[PDB]
Ligand binder design. Structure first.
Ligand SMILES: C=C1[C@@]2(C)C[C@H]3[C@]4(C)CCC(=O)OC(C)(C)[C@H]4CC[C@]3(C)[C@]1(C(=O)OC)C(=O)[C@@](C)(O)C2=O
Ligand SMILES: O=C(O)CCC(=O)C(=O)O
Ligand SMILES: O=C(O)CCC(=O)C(=O)O
Ligand SMILES: [Fe+3]
Ligand SMILES: [Fe+3]
Lengths: 285, 294
């Protein structure tokens, strides 16, 4: 009795809070999974107010030009601005546990690192964001289709509530197993206009979405719908943010060894002439 | 030439004063091409002298087996004024990199993977045959329809001869219908692949696609330490082997041209997907602001 009997059933979106191989199997089969309470409630609020002065100093473009900055606020300096983010959020042992299952190969250590730490605030009345796969950032990845390896995963967590009215992200579970990965355009996508989405949540909930999954933010009067994006890429890919050049050394000295690897203060990709870059940085005892 | 003697594959050769389009077509048909005089003999010789102290402090690893007896040094910008002020400012290098990597309206499509002096010691065993894009392990699966991951300007610092271990290359292997690793399990041509040495004088280089099968040769000499300079260049979305922006000092970065700063990640480049996004950037701006490079 999930939908009234005889109905069209809409694409499945499982939900967990919880065993790791369990949530991974839901990730594999559907491409998207809600993780209710990825961050503790006081933590999400401790973080949200912590960055609210940064967010307050971001002007809103009323552009009507169709891009992803049209009435949507975006801010990446979450490690400087928020001690909660860098000391608590970035240290979820289940996040690494899932990252290690999507990305790492055994005996090769950590196969992943951060792409971005973005806070995305859909300002009230914003056009819907164009449908896209996150792996379009790495433009050849679609050409490998669903047999290709994973490019990117986003732990996309709600900061303020995600409702079907304020602009919550619309997911297309199963778009990671389609046979051809295209740009989602009428010219390029044979299924344009017929793509069935599901809107994605309360503060503290994440959703782990594969980079192969089609999605977008949707279109109220006062609701600043705010989210925290933990985009994570394999170690061979380059990050959107030059974190080891903007995050001060002081904060990097406070990070765990694994979090230093996430931001590229530690490494052989991204090495230093056969040595770990962390030697030259004064980070190895 | 040879006498009904079997004719082995050609490696096209051009001088550094040929037109980039002439050299790129050769690169395009064969996946590799020799640029003679890529670096002047006086530039090569100053570079070799400027890094030689660092090469002398590198021990020769001899093992009981695995690509030993090869010295590898990547701190070229730090050690060599000639390298940073001149070698990396080759306009021919950048002309060709744009033709491979740069997309319309997006600026530089490429940056440095590595800057490696590679000195094959006397008696060093030959290197396994490989493609350089194997470093990005998924790339072979796109086959020859795929885009370029990586290219290398592989420069003779000292002469390349067949005896001292000049690289063995396989022209046209960037066009085989299936890109596998070169082993008995996966490669059906295994043990049947015909290679060709890159015979070069100092300052010559060959430019080679990451799709081309190749390996360092056996250094069968008793005396010759065969020195090379590998300028490996990747597209902007790929991670470098070297964290250049974290070991190269800022004093050296402020002296770099803007295209050099981009190569080493002291500066960002703009990517378009209807949307524009700085790659390797800082919260919407070039990282060169926060670093103080204008
Ligand atoms: C330009 C953009 C790109 C190319 C990248 C993208 C990206 C890093 C990619 C997906 C990912 O892994 O992480 C997150 C969630 C952090 C996003 C954040 C937003 C941006 C920076 C972007 C943008 O802000 O446009 C000015 C977009 O909104 C979008 C979707 O069009 C893009 O694909
Ligand atoms: O803002 C959102 O809800 C979706 C985030 C997203 O799709 C992106 O910008 O990559
Ligand atoms: O040194 C050589 O001749 C070949 C080296 C090489 O091909 C490599 O390191 O990928
Ligand atoms: Fe997205
Ligand atoms: Fe090689």
């Amino acid at each position: 009795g999930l939908v009234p009997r005889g109905s069209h059933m809409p694409p499945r979106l499982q939900r967990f809070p919880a065993s790791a191989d369990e949530i991974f199997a839901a990730f594999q089969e559907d491409g998207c999974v809600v993780i209710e309470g990825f961050i503790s409630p006081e933590q999400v609020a401790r973080f949200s107010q912590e960055v609210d002065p940064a967010m307050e100093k971001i002007p809103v473009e009323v552009t009507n030009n169709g891009n992803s900055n049209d009435r949507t606020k975006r801010f990446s300096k979450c490690v400087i601005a928020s001690p909660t983010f860098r000391n608590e959020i970035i240290e979820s042992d289940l996040m690494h546990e899932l990252c290690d299952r999507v990305f790492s190969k055994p005996g090769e250590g950590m196969g992943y690192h951060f792409n971005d730490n973005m806070v995305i605030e859909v300002q009230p009345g914003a056009p819907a964001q164009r449908l896209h796969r996150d792996q379009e950032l790495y433009p050849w990845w679609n050409s490998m289709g669903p047999a290709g390896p994973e490019c990117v995963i986003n732990f996309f967590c709600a900061v303020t509530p995600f409702t079907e009215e304020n602009g919550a992200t619309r997911l297309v579970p199963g778009s990671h197993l389609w046979p051809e990965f295209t740009q989602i355009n009428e010219r390029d996508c044979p299924q344009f206009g017929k793509i069935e989405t599901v809107p994605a949540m309360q503060p503290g909930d994440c959703y782990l979405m594969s980079g192969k999954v089609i999605h977008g933010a949707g279109h109220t009067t006062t609701d600043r719908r705010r989210a925290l994006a933990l985009a994570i890429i394999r170690r061979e890919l380059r990050p959107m943010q030059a974190f080891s050049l903007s995050v001060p050394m002081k904060l990097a000295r406070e990070m765990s060894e694994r979090s230093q690897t996430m931001f590229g203060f530690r490494s052989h990709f991204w090495g230093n002439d056969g040595k770990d870059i962390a030697h030259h940085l004064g980070l190895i005892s």
